[PDB]
Amino acid sequence: PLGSMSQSNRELVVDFLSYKLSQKGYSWSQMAAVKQALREAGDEFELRYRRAFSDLTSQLHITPGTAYQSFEQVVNELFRDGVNWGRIVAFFSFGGALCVESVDKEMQVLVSRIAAWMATYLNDHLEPWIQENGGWDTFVELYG
Amino acid sequence: GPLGSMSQSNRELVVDFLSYKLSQKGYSWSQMAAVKQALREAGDEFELRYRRAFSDLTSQLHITPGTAYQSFEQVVNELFRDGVNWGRIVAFFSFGGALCVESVDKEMQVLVSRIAAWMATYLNDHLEPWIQENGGWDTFVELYG
Numbered sequence: 001p002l003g004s005m006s007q008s009n010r011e012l013v014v015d016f017l018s019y020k021l022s023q024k025g026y027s028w029s030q031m032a033a034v035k036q037a038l039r040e041a042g043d044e045f046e047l048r049y050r051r052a053f054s055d056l057t058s059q060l061h062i063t064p065g066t067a068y069q070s071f072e073q074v075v076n077e078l079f080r081d082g083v084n085w086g087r088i089v090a091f092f093s094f095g096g097a098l099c100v101e102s103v104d105k106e107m108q109v110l111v112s113r114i115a116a117w118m119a120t121y122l123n124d125h126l127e128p129w130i131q132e133n134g135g136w137d138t139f140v141e142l143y144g
Numbered sequence: 145g146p147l148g149s150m151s152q153s154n155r156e157l158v159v160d161f162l163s164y165k166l167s168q169k170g171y172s173w174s175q176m177a178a179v180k181q182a183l184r185e186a187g188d189e190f191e192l193r194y195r196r197a198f199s200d201l202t203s204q205l206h207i208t209p210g211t212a213y214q215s216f217e218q219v220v221n222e223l224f225r226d227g228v229n230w231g232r233i234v235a236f237f238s239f240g241g242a243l244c245v246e247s248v249d250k251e252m253q254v255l256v257s258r259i260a261a262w263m264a265t266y267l268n269d270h271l272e273p274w275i276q277e278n279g280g281w282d283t284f285v286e287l288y289g
C-alpha cells in the first residue's frame with residue numbers, strides 16, 4: 001500500500017521520542033502519559049497482586065466459541081463489589097492475559113475479538129465510573 | 145462529558161495495552177514491534193556509552209521556536225557526513241530524543257511535534273534508500289537486538 005511507510009515511520013519515531021521523553025519524566029502527549037501509567041500499573045498488578053485473586057481466565061476458559069456475553073459475565077464478577085482503579089487495571093491485565101493465552105493456543109483470531117470486547121465493556125460499563133471519578137488524568141496522578 | 149465521549153480514548157488504551165502485553169511475551173501487535181524495542185535499547189546504549197565521544201549536535205542546532213527543518217537537516221548531515229551506518233542512525237534517533245527533551249526543558253513544547261516531522265522527513269529523504277539496501281530494519285533488529 002502507498003501509505004504504509006508513512007504509518008510505520010511515524011510509529012517508529014513517535015515510539016522512540018515518547019520513550020525518551022518518558023525517561024526524563026515528560027510525555028509525548030497526555031494520552032501517552034495515560035498509556036504509560038496503565039502499562040506500568042498492569043506490570044505492577046501482575047508482579048504483586050494478581051496472585052491474590054480468583055483467576056478470571058479460569059472462569060472464562062476462552063475457546064473459539066466464546067462470545068462477548070461470557071466475557072462480560074466474568075468481568076462483571078471482577079466488578080461485583082464496585083469499580084475502582086485497581087480493578088480497572090486488573091481488567092486490562094485480564095484482557096492482556098486472554099490475548100497471550102489465545103496466541104499460545106494458536107487461536108490468534110481471538111485477539112481481535114478480545115480487543116473488541118474490551119472496548120465495548122469500557123464503553124458500556126466503565127466509562128461512567130471513569131468520568132465520575134476524575135477521568136484518566138486522575139488515574140495518572142494516582143498510578144503514574 | 146456525555147457518555148460516548150471517552151470511547152476513542154478508551155479504545156486507544158485497549159490497543160496500546162494489549163500490544164504491550166503481547167510484546168512482553170514475544171508477540172507482535174504491530175509489524176514494527178521488534179524494531180521499536182531494538183531501537184529503544186540501542187538508543188539507551190548509545191547514550192550511556194558512546195554519545196560522550198562526539199560533538200554535541202544539540203549545541204550545533206541550538207534549537208529555538210524559530211528553528212526550521214533546514215537547520216535540523218544541516219546538523220544531521222554533519223552526523224552522516226562520512227557515510228551512513230546503523231550506529232549513526234541510532235545516534236540520529238538519540239539526537240531527536242534529546243532535542244525533544246531540551247524543547248520541553250526550555251518551555252518550547254511546540255517543537256516536539258516539529259522534531260518528529262523533521263525526523264520523518266530526514267528518514268524519507270536521506271536514510272530510507274540506505275536502509276533498504278542494507279537489509280531493512282529487520283537487519284537492524286538482528287544486529288542490535
Ligand SMILES: O=C(Nc1nc2ccccc2s1)c1cccc2c1CN(c1nc(C(=O)O)c(CCCOc3ccc(-n4ncc5cncnc54)cc3)s1)CC2
Nearest residue numbers: 041044045053054055056057078086087090093094097143
Ligand atoms: O482480578 C481478579 N482476577 C484476576 N484474574 C486474572 C487473570 C489473568 C490476568 C489478570 C487477572 S485479574 C479478580 C477476580 C474476581 C474478583 C475480583 C478480582 C480483583 N479484585 C481486585 N480488587 C482490588 C482492590 O484494590 O480493591 C484490585 C486491585 C489490587 C491492587 O492493584 C494495583 C495496585 C497498585 C498498582 N500500582 N501500579 C503502579 C502504581 C503506582 N502507585 C501506586 N500504585 C500503583 C497497580 C495495581 S483487583 C477484587 C474482585
Ligand SMILES: O=C(Nc1nc2ccccc2s1)c1cccc2c1CN(c1nc(C(=O)O)c(CCCOc3ccc(-n4ncc5cncnc54)cc3)s1)CC2
Nearest residue numbers: 186189190198199200201202223231232235238239242288
Ligand atoms: O553523534 C554525534 N553527535 C551526537 N550529539 C548528540 C546530542 C544529543 C543526543 C545524541 C547525540 S549524537 C556526531 C556528531 C558529529 C559527527 C558524528 C557524530 C556521530 N558519529 C558516529 N559514528 C559512529 C560509528 O560507529 O561510526 C556512531 C555509532 C557509535 C556506536 O553506537 C552504538 C553502538 C552500539 C549500540 N548497540 N546498542 C545495542 C547493541 C547491541 N549489539 C550491538 N550494538 C549495540 C548502539 C549504538 S555515532 C560520527 C559522526
